[PDB]
Amino acid sequence: MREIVHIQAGQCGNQIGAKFWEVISDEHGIDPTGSYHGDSDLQLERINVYYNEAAGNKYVPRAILVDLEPGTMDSVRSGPFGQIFRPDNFVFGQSGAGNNWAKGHYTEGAELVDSVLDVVRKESESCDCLQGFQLTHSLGGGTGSGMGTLLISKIREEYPDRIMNTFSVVPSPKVSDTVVEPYNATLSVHQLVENTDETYCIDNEALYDICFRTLKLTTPTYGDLNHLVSATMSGVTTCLRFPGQLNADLRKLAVNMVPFPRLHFFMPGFAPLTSRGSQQYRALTVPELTQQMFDAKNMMAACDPRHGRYLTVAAVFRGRMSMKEVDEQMLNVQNKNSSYFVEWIPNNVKTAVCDIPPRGLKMSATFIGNSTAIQELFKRISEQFTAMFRRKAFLHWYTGEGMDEMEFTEAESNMNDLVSEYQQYQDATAD
Amino acid sequence: GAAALKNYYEVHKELFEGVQKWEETWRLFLEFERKASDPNRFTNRGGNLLKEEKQRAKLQKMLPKLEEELKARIELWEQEHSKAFMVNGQKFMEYVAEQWEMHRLEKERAKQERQLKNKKQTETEMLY
Amino acid sequence: MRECISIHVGQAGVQIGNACWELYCLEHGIQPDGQMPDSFNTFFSETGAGKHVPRAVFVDLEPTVIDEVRTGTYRQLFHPEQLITGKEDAANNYARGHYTIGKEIIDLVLDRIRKLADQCTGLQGFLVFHSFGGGTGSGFTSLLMERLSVDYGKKSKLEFSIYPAPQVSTAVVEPYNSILTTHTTLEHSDCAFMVDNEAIYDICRRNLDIERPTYTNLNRLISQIVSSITASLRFDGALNVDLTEFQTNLVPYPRIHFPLATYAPVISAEKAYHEQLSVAEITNACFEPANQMVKCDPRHGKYMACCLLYRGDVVPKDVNAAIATIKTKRIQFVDWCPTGFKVGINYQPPTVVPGGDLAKVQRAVCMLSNTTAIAEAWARLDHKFDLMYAKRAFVHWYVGEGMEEGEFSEAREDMAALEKDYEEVGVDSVE
Ligand SMILES: CC[C@H](/C=C(/C)[C@@H]1C[C@@H](OC)C[C@H](O)C(C)(C)[C@@]2(O)O[C@@H](C[C@@H](OC)[C@H](O)C(=O)O1)C[C@@H](OC)[C@H]2O)CO
Ligand SMILES: Nc1nc2c(ncn2[C@@H]2O[C@H](COP(=O)(O)OP(=O)(O)OP(=O)(O)O)[C@@H](O)[C@H]2O)c(=O)[nH]1
Ligand SMILES: Nc1nc2c(ncn2[C@@H]2O[C@H](COP(=O)(O)OP(=O)(O)O)[C@@H](O)[C@H]2O)c(=O)[nH]1
Numbered sequence A: 001m002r003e004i005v006h007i008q009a010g011q012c013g014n015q016i017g018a019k020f021w022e023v024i025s026d027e028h029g030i031d032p033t034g035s036y037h038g039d040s041d042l043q044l045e046r047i048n049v050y051y052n053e054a055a056g057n058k059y060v061p062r063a064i065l066v067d068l069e070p071g072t073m074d075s076v077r078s079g080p081f082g083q084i085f086r087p088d089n090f091v092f093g094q095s096g097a098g099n100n101w102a103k104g105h106y107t108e109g110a111e112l113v114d115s116v117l118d119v120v121r122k123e124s125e126s127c128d129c130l131q132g133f134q135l136t137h138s139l140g141g142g143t144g145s146g147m148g149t150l151l152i153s154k155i156r157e158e159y160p161d162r163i164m165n166t167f168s169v170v171p172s173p174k175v176s177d178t179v180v181e182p183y184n185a186t187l188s189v190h191q192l193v194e195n196t197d198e199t200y201c202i203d204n205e206a207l208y209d210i211c212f213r214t215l216k217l218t219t220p221t222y223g224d225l226n227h228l229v230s231a232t233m234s235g236v237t238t239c240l241r242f243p244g245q246l247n248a249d250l251r252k253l254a255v256n257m258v259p260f261p262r263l264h265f266f267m268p269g270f271a272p273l274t275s276r277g278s279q280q281y282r283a284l285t286v287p288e289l290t291q292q293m294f295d296a297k298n299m300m301a302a303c304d305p306r307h308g309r310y311l312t313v314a315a316v317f318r319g320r321m322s323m324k325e326v327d328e329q330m331l332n333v334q335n336k337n338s339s340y341f342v343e344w345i346p347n348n349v350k351t352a353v354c355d356i357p358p359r360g361l362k363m364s365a366t367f368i369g370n371s372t373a374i375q376e377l378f379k380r381i382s383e384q385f386t387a388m389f390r391r392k393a394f395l396h397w398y399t400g401e402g403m404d405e406m407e408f409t410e411a412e413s414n415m416n417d418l419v420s421e422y423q424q425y426q427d428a429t430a431d
Numbered sequence B: 001g002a003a004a005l006k007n008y009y010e011v012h013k014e015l016f017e018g019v020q021k022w023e024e025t026w027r028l029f030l031e032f033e034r035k036a037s038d039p040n041r042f043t044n045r046g047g048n049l050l051k052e053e054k055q056r057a058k059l060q061k062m063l064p065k066l067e068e069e070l071k072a073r074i075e076l077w078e079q080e081h082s083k084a085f086m087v088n089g090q091k092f093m094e095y096v097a098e099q100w101e102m103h104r105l106e107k108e109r110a111k112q113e114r115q116l117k118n119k120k121q122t123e124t125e126m127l128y
Numbered sequence C: 001m002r003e004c005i006s007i008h009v010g011q012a013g014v015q016i017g018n019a020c021w022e023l024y025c026l027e028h029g030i031q032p033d034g035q036m037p038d039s040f041n042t043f044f045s046e047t048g049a050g051k052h053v054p055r056a057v058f059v060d061l062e063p064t065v066i067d068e069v070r071t072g073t074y075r076q077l078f079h080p081e082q083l084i085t086g087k088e089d090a091a092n093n094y095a096r097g098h099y100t101i102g103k104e105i106i107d108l109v110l111d112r113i114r115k116l117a118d119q120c121t122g123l124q125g126f127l128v129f130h131s132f133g134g135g136t137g138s139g140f141t142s143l144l145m146e147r148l149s150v151d152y153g154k155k156s157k158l159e160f161s162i163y164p165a166p167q168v169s170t171a172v173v174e175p176y177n178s179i180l181t182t183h184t185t186l187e188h189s190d191c192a193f194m195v196d197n198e199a200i201y202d203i204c205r206r207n208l209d210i211e212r213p214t215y216t217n218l219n220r221l222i223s224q225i226v227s228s229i230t231a232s233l234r235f236d237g238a239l240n241v242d243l244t245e246f247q248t249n250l251v252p253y254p255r256i257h258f259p260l261a262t263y264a265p266v267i268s269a270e271k272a273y274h275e276q277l278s279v280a281e282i283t284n285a286c287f288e289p290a291n292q293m294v295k296c297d298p299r300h301g302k303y304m305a306c307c308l309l310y311r312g313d314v315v316p317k318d319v320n321a322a323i324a325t326i327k328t329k330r331i332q333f334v335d336w337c338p339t340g341f342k343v344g345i346n347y348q349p350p351t352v353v354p355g356g357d358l359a360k361v362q363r364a365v366c367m368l369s370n371t372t373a374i375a376e377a378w379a380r381l382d383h384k385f386d387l388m389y390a391k392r393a394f395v396h397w398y399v400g401e402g403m404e405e406g407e408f409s410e411a412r413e414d415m416a417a418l419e420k421d422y423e424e425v426g427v428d429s430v431e
């Protein structure tokens, strides 16, 4: 079998991860004590992908939780599934870093990481075929970005041939919930780009819109938001955990989604998301699903794909459905809206099918889009970045941590070039 | 007269030097053939690959353009003057073809060399 | 005795194999436990207890697929070592399938094959099943063939392959993998049989009059074709055709060896009751563009050679009459050919698989066809390749696995020649 290491970093990362593991355990019949009470042999058969059968019937999700300070991971341990985790996988310091990327990637993180990695190594040692790593982190967070970035680099150093992917939480185009976002985010990306093999962009902003609209919710609690995200994450690796018709290994996804290194940012989506108040007025067909999947309004990343083109799209389906329906339906999309796809690439769609549906959803699908419209995000960031940077805003909170100002200019350089790259391909033509 | 000497001189600028221009273009072409071998360029931070492609196509067109021009210019010269248009023991158009084939055949050879090496590698593994 | 070894490679190869062996057992009365509560020694060997053991090797770098087999209904029909699995798949990457991953398995595979071959009294050839585009199918098979041809330079090398249909999806990096494989395939394969999933869907829709088909019955259709071919060996007929004769009767020029296939009379019981499926009727159906298993309107080109395989209640003279009519139908043939029809007749009528979606008939026709029309498909493929290659999309995934960039150029070059070959054949040779 192939194994995945799940690393969680930062308050956000840990909170998301907590929900993630809840979801995964649920799907495999694992209760809060780590005891197996599933119904299908499949649940157990390939459980190895995530859990390490410790002893008896106790399974221990191979996850590592990291934070610079307590009060977060603590709450995780106090929660429903706190006891499912092995204590020794909780690695944290006793200092904060109020969204101080420098601290997270230097003066504080440099100490903490000395541990962390040791645990990582141990976990990788227990694996038979290390599929890769998953990092749940939030951009802009002193830990999430600081440590996140650091760890990524350090891991590739020792596992250059493994697939690394992360589910980053990006900056919001609307109200920012931090002050020094631009800086932290930019600094992270500066290195992220040159490391992680693929990364997903999820924006709370977009998620709120979905909730208030599509889900008809009025109290979009972070727990609910995380739940939604978790669902997406689980979909991504369903192909590893369960049998299907067209299994798509994590690596495979990278191959059909990244055309050029560096250009590996994705917009995630998910269907169906019908509110309970209207579920009875649905059909739940392959067409219905694709309607949602390609609906700009269901993009979990706060960008409007309508203004860009897709370099490539992956569609992973779960449950039951015909091959005919899927393929034909996906074709129709490309044909009807050909202007939204990059002419350089014939067949801009990768599909996959697993025979195991989400609990309660006979049909479900995830959407991974590599749209050039993501450029927009980076553009926004760069603009905000230079606005602050040229005024030297708050730079003393980075300089004071031993950060060289030049690092910022380098970071910008990478960022701007990223934008340029997308812009070039955006309108580059075959002839 | 001097005017006639200057006339063929201008032809030579479009011919003799024209070949040199072909050779210069040819040289650059070879530089692209060389640069193409550096796999690091796949990390095209600046969109390099698109830039390269445009240039590759350009040169592919240029070399034919210049050759066709030279075919007419060399004719003009030899019609205007009995001396065969050759240098260093080879006709300038032969020289064009010479370097062309030099590259061609070498590239083909090198390919075949590696093909053989792969065949011998395969053999070795079967023997193993 | 005439013996044959089947090889199933990759998701498709294996999954198709499942359908095939399911069928083989049915036809020979073999029960899932290898039991038979006199023509078996071609695909089956006898063990000490008399138990039947099918003669095939399943290879798939993605253990998931094989595990389905290992835990499936027919898990009792395979000698464990016939089910060879890897730890990580090729991620739709020919280079992984050929150079970096498959490289480490192929030794085992060949050894197993050899041992199987050593059980034979007279091996006719091999039947390789794979898909273009599949990193394993495409990449690994390339490697496999390369080495099989060394040990068995005189054995028939037949293969069936899924040809990335013009307008379908599944993977993005298809045309790369496809061509890369073709480039090597041409130098080892004796005859490949092209099948399009796309075309089949159409058939399911119009002939079977069904909707929502999956590989669970798409493959069943395919297995009928396979059976039809090997039925010649397995049952007495008026005109038995040994596998070797397919070279002679299909290929007229080394490099060209991609027959298309069809199968009549596909039909639901609903219509069966209202339609007399005569020999002539069926024969005509085989030449109706609509019924081809490959998305290629045969009228665009000319026929080079056809081979008809009749099963069940047929009468030589009626068959001849039907063919004569076909010849009259001014269906074009190249001047290089004056006959174009080689016909086999097997007494054993078609069967039907319990729970299948195909009505049982008293007679059926499988047709193999070498036509210049296929050149179109090749052109389409090459075109797609050119577009992606120009920008060098996804190329780094291959180069990172040790593939030479120039290797792509090489392959393309050869493909150009291939297309040209077809053009030359259809020149209509005349003084
Ligand atoms: C294909 C990828 C995709 C891009 C486009 C343009 C796609 C195309 C189609 O969906 C596939 C639209 C679709 O066929 C509909 C008309 C039924 C519909 O869904 O369109 C939207 C608006 C549309 O944008 C205008 C949408 O937001 C969107 O994203 O559309 C309102 C909606 O109210 C119920 C309904 O009327 C991005 O992922
Ligand atoms: N007819 C049919 N086609 C299939 C089946 N499974 C996959 N395919 C087709 O095969 C192609 C994909 O190749 P796969 O065989 O899935 O890939 P693979 O050989 O497992 O290689 P990797 O997964 O890349 O290691 C696509 O064109 C699919 O539509 C099947 O059961 N039946
Ligand atoms: N989706 C989501 N976002 C969160 C959560 N907790 C914090 N955030 C977001 O994460 C960012 C703040 O970073 P945080 O992880 O708390 O800082 P850190 O501990 O220094 O990494 C902000 O954009 C918050 O909106 C959560 O549980 N879910």
Ligand SMILES: [Mg+2]
Binding pocket: C010, C011, C060, C062, C089, C134, C136
């Ligand atoms: Mg596979």
